[PDB]
Amino acid sequence: TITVSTPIKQIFPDDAFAETIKANLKKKSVTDAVTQNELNSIDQIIANNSDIKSVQGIQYLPNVRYLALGGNKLHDISALKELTNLGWLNLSNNQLETLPQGVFEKLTNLTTLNLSNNQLTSLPQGVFERLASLTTLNLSNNNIANINDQMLEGLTNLTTLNLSHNNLARLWKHANPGGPIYFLKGLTNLTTLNLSSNGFDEIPREVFKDLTSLTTLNLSNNNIANINDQMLEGLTNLTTLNLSHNNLARLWKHANPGGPIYFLKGLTNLTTLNLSSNGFDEIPREVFKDLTSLTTLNLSNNQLTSLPQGVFERLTNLKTLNLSNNQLQ
DSSP, X not given: OXXXXXXXXXXXXXXXXXXXXXXXXXXXXXXXEEOHHHHHTOOEEEOXXXXXXXXXXXXXXXXXOEEEOTTSOOOOOGGGTTOXXXXXXXXXXXOOOOOOTTTTTTOTTOOEEEOOSSOOOBOOTXXXXXXXXXXXXXXXXXXXXXXXXXXXXXXXXXXXXXXOSXXXXXGGOTTSTTOOXXXXXXXXXXXXXXXXXXXXXXXXXXXXXXXXXXXXXXXXXXXXXXXXXXXXXXXXXOOEEEOXXXXXXXXXXXXXXXSOOOTTTTOTTOOEEEOOSSOOOXXXXXXXXXXXXXXXXXXOSSOOOOOOTTTTTTOTTOOEEEOOSSSOO
């Protein structure tokens, strides 16, 4: 608590953040004095892209609920640890290299946590374990190479998970010591999962089996060359699947030992399918037979030289078919 009238600049030593508080409070100067009663009135700070280097002083804003600090220069967030009213936190595009042990332990009201576009390489044990109301977790565009399988446990309300643009490939190799990491266990409310741009070349069997609410799966821009045909088993609500920019070609060749892999079987609710840039030189005649709902099908930028007669005929809802930049007639 600020117990005596104190200049804003004395509480918030970062020039940019002092200006932020001044503006929020509609004070005329950062030399203007404030009381805790005025700081108590602050429940939102929206200060993305503001050249903030330090949020020191934010400890005196106990009632902050919405905190937007993307696009600043932060390297330390330990000043947030007692901000128990936080519901929404954007720390995207800062200079965070690590997260302090226990930093989010008390942020039990957080619904949305955006840590994208930082320099994170690992996550401490238990870092998210108290975030019972978290619906949205964005860790994209970091350098994250270690996760253990209890990172996301009891995030039962998680609906959106973005792990794109990291270095998770090692964890899903069948030969990973101790076994592959099944970090998507128990996420039964997850609807959107982005695992693009991670260098993945193997997909552990049943790795997605608990994701019964999943509607959108983005596995693009990986090195994926083996799918077996049960990857997407029971993911019946899947509507959007992006497998573009992978290495699936061999799985669709008639001479594949031992037949094409029919990895799209059963996807009767799928509306959007992107299979562009996979090197496909053939499309098996029956590979789309179950895709009753398909509306948009992107097969661009492959190596297709013909198409079996009738391959698209069961696709009665198809509106957009992109066959561009193949070697077709």
